[PDB]
Amino acid sequence: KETAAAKFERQHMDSSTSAASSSNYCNQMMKSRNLTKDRCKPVNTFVHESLADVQAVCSQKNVACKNGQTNCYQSYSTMSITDCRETGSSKYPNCAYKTTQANKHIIVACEGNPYVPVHFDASV
Numbered sequence: 798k799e800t801a802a803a804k805f806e807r808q809h810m811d812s813s814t815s816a817a818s819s820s821n822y823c824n825q826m827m828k829s830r831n832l833t834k835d836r837c838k839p840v841n842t843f844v845h846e847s848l849a850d851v852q853a854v855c856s857q858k859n860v861a862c863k864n865g866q867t868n869c870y871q872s873y874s875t876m877s878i879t880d881c882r883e884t885g886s887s888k889y890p891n892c893a894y895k896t897t898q899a900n901k902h903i904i905v906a907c908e909g910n911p912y913v914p915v916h917f918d919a920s921v
Contacts, residue, residue: 815845827881842878870906
């Protein structure tokens, strides 16, 4: 099994690029990060910032998670992100994703000691 922290890193961190390179960014990353193995993960965001910067969000603006949890945090500033969302031409095993680049606040849920992101709630 994966730690929640490591699963967040695998699903949501891409510090290697300042932003999505091509329209094929999502198809490549969703596969690469093993998010299309059992099924097409329907929605998933990658954050193009350093891991320290994203971890730092756990000490930023305390907000509610969409399900009502109290351990969500909104980043004070916007971040470079890529939203990956399954499109109409997508059918497992042939997953197809729309790539949408944006610069927005992120909201994550945090847990543990050290207190780190374990869930990507939303972007605003």
